[PDB]
Ligand binder design. Structure first.
Ligand SMILES: COc1cccc(CN)c1
Ligand SMILES: [Ca+2]
Length: 223
């Protein structure tokens, strides 16, 4: 997260870190056994880390649970990043509490102008590289489909939305990938892509989660 703020330990209780020897992506806990992330975060040997603030220090609220399976969306295209969503099942159910909690799926799609919370352990620099140890947060509005399409000609599908600031300075970045965009207590987006970070007229692009609720529910019900 570039130009954000320190969230505060365990203030974003649905935020997970995906770890394969190191943090490589964010995710969102959607029930005791399932995490939603980006399909571009797919790899084998994933351990889901819940209750994290400082990802380099065991602070006492963590649960570390290995993934038993990953399910990338059947229509995910890695070139265009269309359908950039993946489900991860935990080998055992997380113990839910005030600091490890699921986030609700949307019942409706959020509109342009809606204020949301984007969070993660990604790069905090727009030019350099600096990775934080503690969770960073950014309040950001959803941008209109037209401004999103104008920012990225030929690249925005019906399964994507832009959020952030056309002036730059405040954005998600590398390592925030797969993490949440939450608006009014619903998971509306997944950190998906962009051109660099916090650059003028190049806002973050997010997977439009409301399009996938049926798939998520069906998949969970049979797996
Ligand atoms: C350039 O790599 C990125 C990864 C995740 C999110 C974004 C959006 N600035 C960019
Ligand atoms: Ca920790």
């Amino acid at each position: 997260i570039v130009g954000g703020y320190t969230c505060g330990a365990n203030t974003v209780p649905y935020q997970v870190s995906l770890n394969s020897g190191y943090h490589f992506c964010g995710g969102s806990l959607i029930n005791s056994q399932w995490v939603v992330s980006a399909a571009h975060c797919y790899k084998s040997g994933i351990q889901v880390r819940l209750g994290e603030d400082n990802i380099n220090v065991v602070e006492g609220n963590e649960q570390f649970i290995s993934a038993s399976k990953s399910i990338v969306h059947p229509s995910y295209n890695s070139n265009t990043l269309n359908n950039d969503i993946m489900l991860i099942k935990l080998k055992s159910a997380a113990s839910l509490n005030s600091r490890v909690a699921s986030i609700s799926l949307p019942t409706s799609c959020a509109s342009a102008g809606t204020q949301c919370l984007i969070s993660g352990w990604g790069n905090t620099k727009s030019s350099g590289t600096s990775y934080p140890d503690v969770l960073k947060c950014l309040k950001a509005p959803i941008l209109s489909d037209s401004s999103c399409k104008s920012a990225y000609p030929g690249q925005i599908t019906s399964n994507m939305f832009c959020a952030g600031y056309l002036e730059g300075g405040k954005d998600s970045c590398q390592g925030d990938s797969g993490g949440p965009v939450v608006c009014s207590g619903k998971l509306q987006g997944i950190v998906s892509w962009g051109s660099g970070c916090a650059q003028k007229n190049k806002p973050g692009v997010y997977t439009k989660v409301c399009n996938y609720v049926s798939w998520i529910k069906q998949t969970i019900a049979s797996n």
